[PDB]
Symmetry: C2
Subunit: 101 residues, 2 copies
């Protein structure tokens, strides 16, 4: 079926946004969220899978990363690179595939 793919480059976390934490055991929650628009819209939300295909993380603090999928519409999806506490992310990229349901 209609299969589409792309890659989100989140870059250095200095440019990421503070976001409220959804977990009281995590603080300093930060993310680079993007609304991705499909090159060809679907009529119904496709299945999207995310894959972390680049990481550059500081060794002196724990590695803490999430590739978050927030929502999928027929025309796009919202995803983020997400970290917390004292992790330092110098780069992170998320490869993705969408497949008609």
């Amino acid at each position: 079926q209609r299969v589409q793919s792309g890659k989100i480059d989140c870059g250095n976390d200095v440019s990421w946004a503070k976001v409220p934490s959804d977990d009281p055991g995590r603080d300093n929650t930060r993310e680079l969220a993007k609304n991705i628009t499909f090159a060809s819209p679907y009529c119904r939300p496709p299945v999207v899978l995310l894959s972390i295909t680049q990481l550059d993380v500081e060794q002196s603090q724990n590695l803490r990363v999430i590739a978050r999928l927030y929502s999928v519409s027929p025309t796009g999806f919202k995803a983020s690179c997400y970290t917390w506490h004292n992790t330092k992310v110098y780069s992170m990229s998320i490869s993705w595939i969408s497949i008609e349901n």
Copy 2:
């Protein structure tokens, strides 16, 4: 006996030095160390007591502070304001007294 007093103002931790940690359970150890010279030297090392008399610390991370006394000579002493991990110190001051032994 000859009693002397003063106050060390360490200021904002952005200007503090990274120092090697003396405790594997502490990282990001940082300090503002000063070599204090007594206005009137002693012939023997006096007793020095340190007191933390100013603190301005960020509430979003734990408060972690030490007023460290490293050494005392007849002519002075070495002390520091010391913090670690993700504590943010905006100001810290150490009042001190020296008393002939």
